[PDB]
Write an enzyme that holds these catalytic residues in place. Structure first.
Site, short mmCIF file in Angstrom:
data_model
loop_
_atom_site.label_atom_id
_atom_site.label_comp_id
_atom_site.label_asym_id
_atom_site.label_seq_id
_atom_site.Cartn_x
_atom_site.Cartn_y
_atom_site.Cartn_z
N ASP A 180 15.58 64.08 -29.05
CA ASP A 180 16.44 64.99 -29.93
C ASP A 180 16.01 66.44 -30.16
OD1 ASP A 180 18.28 62.97 -30.16
OD2 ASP A 180 17.32 62.23 -32.04
N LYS B 74 23.55 55.65 -24.62
CA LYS B 74 24.14 56.36 -25.73
C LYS B 74 25.53 56.80 -25.37
CE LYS B 74 23.54 60.67 -28.45
NZ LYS B 74 22.57 61.76 -28.77
N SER C 69 26.17 56.92 -30.61
CA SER C 69 25.68 55.65 -31.02
C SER C 69 24.82 55.12 -29.83
CB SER C 69 26.90 54.77 -31.24
OG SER C 69 26.53 53.61 -31.86
N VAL C 70 23.74 54.38 -30.09
CA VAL C 70 22.82 53.95 -29.04
C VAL C 70 22.73 52.44 -29.07
CG1 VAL C 70 20.36 54.08 -28.32
CG2 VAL C 70 21.54 56.05 -29.30
O1 LIG Z 1 14.60 48.45 -29.13
C1 LIG Z 1 14.76 48.96 -30.24
N1 LIG Z 1 15.23 48.23 -31.22
C2 LIG Z 1 15.52 46.77 -31.04
C3 LIG Z 1 15.46 46.08 -32.41
N2 LIG Z 1 14.24 46.34 -33.21
C4 LIG Z 1 14.45 45.59 -34.48
C5 LIG Z 1 13.32 44.81 -34.98
O2 LIG Z 1 12.31 44.47 -33.95
C6 LIG Z 1 12.48 44.75 -32.55
C7 LIG Z 1 12.93 46.20 -32.50
C8 LIG Z 1 14.51 50.37 -30.49
C9 LIG Z 1 14.30 50.86 -31.79
C10 LIG Z 1 14.07 52.24 -31.98
C11 LIG Z 1 14.04 53.12 -30.89
C12 LIG Z 1 14.27 52.66 -29.60
C13 LIG Z 1 14.50 51.28 -29.41
C14 LIG Z 1 14.32 53.51 -28.48
O3 LIG Z 1 13.84 53.06 -27.43
C15 LIG Z 1 15.13 54.67 -28.50
C16 LIG Z 1 15.59 55.22 -27.28
C17 LIG Z 1 16.48 56.28 -27.19
C18 LIG Z 1 16.96 56.88 -28.35
N3 LIG Z 1 17.84 57.95 -28.41
C19 LIG Z 1 18.48 58.59 -27.37
C20 LIG Z 1 19.12 57.93 -26.29
C21 LIG Z 1 19.80 58.66 -25.31
C22 LIG Z 1 19.87 60.02 -25.41
F1 LIG Z 1 20.49 60.68 -24.49
C23 LIG Z 1 19.22 60.72 -26.47
N4 LIG Z 1 19.39 62.06 -26.52
C24 LIG Z 1 18.36 62.92 -26.81
O4 LIG Z 1 17.21 62.56 -27.01
C25 LIG Z 1 18.64 64.29 -26.89
C26 LIG Z 1 17.80 65.20 -26.22
C27 LIG Z 1 18.09 66.59 -26.33
C28 LIG Z 1 19.17 67.05 -27.13
C29 LIG Z 1 19.97 66.13 -27.78
C30 LIG Z 1 19.69 64.77 -27.65
C31 LIG Z 1 18.55 60.01 -27.41
C32 LIG Z 1 16.45 56.39 -29.58
C33 LIG Z 1 15.56 55.35 -29.65
O5 LIG Z 1 15.20 55.12 -30.96
C34 LIG Z 1 13.86 54.50 -31.17
#
Ligand SMILES: O=C(NCCN1CCOCC1)c1ccc2c(c1)C(=O)c1ccc(Nc3ccc(F)c(NC(=O)c4ccccc4)c3)cc1OC2
Ligand SMILES: CCCCCCCCO[C@@H]1O[C@H](CO)[C@@H](O)[C@H](O)[C@H]1O
Ligand SMILES: CCCCCCCCO[C@@H]1O[C@H](CO)[C@@H](O)[C@H](O)[C@H]1O
Length: 331
Positions: A162, A47, A31-32
């Site tokens: 991801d 996360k 969960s993030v």
């Molecule tokens: O701030 C956001 N939302 C606030 C509310 N919104 C609502 C309406 O208006 C304002 C915006 C927001 C909305 C969408 C997104 C992010 C941030 C982002 O920064 C963002 C940042 C990180 C994230 N996923 C994440 C976090 C930590 C991690 F470790 C990972 N892991 C991996 O990527 C990963 C890499 C290799 C293999 C397995 C996993 C992934 C996913 C994200 O999703 C996109």
């Protein structure tokens, strides 16, 4: 060792160092939350892994994700700003938290079903390819690239999420459980994404699995003889042979930059062996205003020997623990 606080988020207790304040869920093997890192002044995503050591499979998944995140050091790939656990020992080690930049949105948010200008598409796709060149150079394939996996900030900077683990962006061979995937499975997805940024609509919005394959074949044609030579099953070839010309993309993407069209034509080829690579695509004339061959870096080789190992649950946990212990933040 910092001091932690506990709160109830998304139905569980999250225990994190006091530096991270204002945790707010952004959504959902983890969960993030969005937070603010009071110690660095940065907005971050935190996360919490779900049940990270519950089984051998979860334990290896946890280790996979941490190893991948610790390896990736590139502007267009999500990186690790911090990793923590509230455990003081291996014995008490049951939770893992990963911290990255909070980009603030994903690519659906930047499109809202409207077409983007050609300049903006150039920049977005350039960044995706630059990240993919880097990922692919480590011998890692994303396999499920899509808008929801592309994080973007307000200055329009993009990071891929991801990697290394909706079907509208999936390469057709992935949908057919072909195996032996080429890195250009990801280039298929980039073409689907680019088409949609240019046109404002989904390129292949299939209703179900078979409908998706039907839409693809409509655009790109039924397989040619050079491709059919690579399929063993007579029944599969018999099916295919019982069915389509390849459309002209110049007359499909009307109004688009002809260099966009030609790049799309090189990406959306059914035969993965004939698709353009990320490196090759970065040198395509479409990207002339952004391309710099001396700033499109490759990764250090990534030791993936763990992937073939079958170890015990405590071994995977120990290996993860060590990786948490050894983590040094980036500059
Ligand atoms: O701030 C956001 N939302 C606030 C509310 N919104 C609502 C309406 O208006 C304002 C915006 C927001 C909305 C969408 C997104 C992010 C941030 C982002 O920064 C963002 C940042 C990180 C994230 N996923 C994440 C976090 C930590 C991690 F470790 C990972 N892991 C991996 O990527 C990963 C890499 C290799 C293999 C397995 C996993 C992934 C996913 C994200 O999703 C996109
Ligand atoms: C009916 C839809 C036909 C889909 C044909 C997809 C062909 C994908 O292309 C194939 O991918 C494999 C790598 O995964 C390679 O081993 C093959 O050499 C390559 O031709
Ligand atoms: C009705 C069946 C249509 C299926 C069309 C494509 C299925 C391709 O199938 C694939 O062929 C590869 C090359 O021989 C094999 O190595 C893969 O095992 C196999 O999945």
């Amino acid at each position: 060792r910092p001091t932690f606080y506990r709160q109830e988020l998304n139905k569980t207790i999250w225990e994190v160092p006091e530096r991270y304040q204002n945790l707010s869920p952004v959504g959902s093997y983890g969960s993030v939350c969005a937070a603010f890192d009071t110690k660095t002044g940065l907005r971050v995503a935190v996360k919490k892994l779900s049940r990270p050591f519950q089984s051998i499979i979860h334990a290896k998944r946890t280790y996979r994700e941490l190893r991948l995140l610790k390896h990736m050091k590139h502007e267009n790939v999500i990186g690790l700003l911090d990793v923590f656990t509230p455990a003081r020992s291996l014995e008490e080690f049951n939770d893992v938290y990963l911290v990255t930049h909070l980009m603030g949105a994903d690519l659906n948010n930047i499109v809202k079903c409207q077409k983007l200008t050609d300049d903006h598409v150039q920049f977005l796709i350039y960044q995706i390819l630059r990240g993919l060149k880097y990922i692919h150079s480590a011998d890692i394939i994303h396999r499920d690239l899509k808008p929801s996996n592309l994080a973007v900030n307000e200055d329009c900077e993009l990071k891929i999420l991801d990697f290394g683990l909706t079907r509208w962006y999936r390469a057709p061979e992935i949908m057919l459980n072909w195996m032996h995937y080429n890195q250009t499975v990801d280039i298929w997805s980039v073409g689907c994404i680019m088409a949609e940024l240019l046109t404002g609509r989904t390129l292949f919005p299939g209703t179900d699995h078979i409908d998706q394959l039907k839409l693809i074949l409509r655009l790109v044609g039924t397989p040619g003889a050079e491709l059919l030579k690579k399929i063993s099953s007579e029944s599969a070839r018999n099916y295919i042979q019982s069915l389509m010309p390849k459309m002209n993309f110049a007359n499909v993407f009307i109004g688009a930059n002809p260099l966009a069209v030609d790049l799309l034509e090189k990406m959306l080829v059914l035969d993965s062996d004939k698709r353009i690579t990320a490196a090759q695509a970065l040198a395509h004339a479409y990207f002339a205003q952004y391309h710099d061959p001396d700033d499109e870096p490759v990764a250090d080789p990534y030791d993936q020997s763990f992937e073939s190992r079958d170890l015990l649950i405590d071994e995977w946990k120990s290996l993860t623990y060590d990786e948490v212990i050894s983590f040094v933040p980036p500059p």
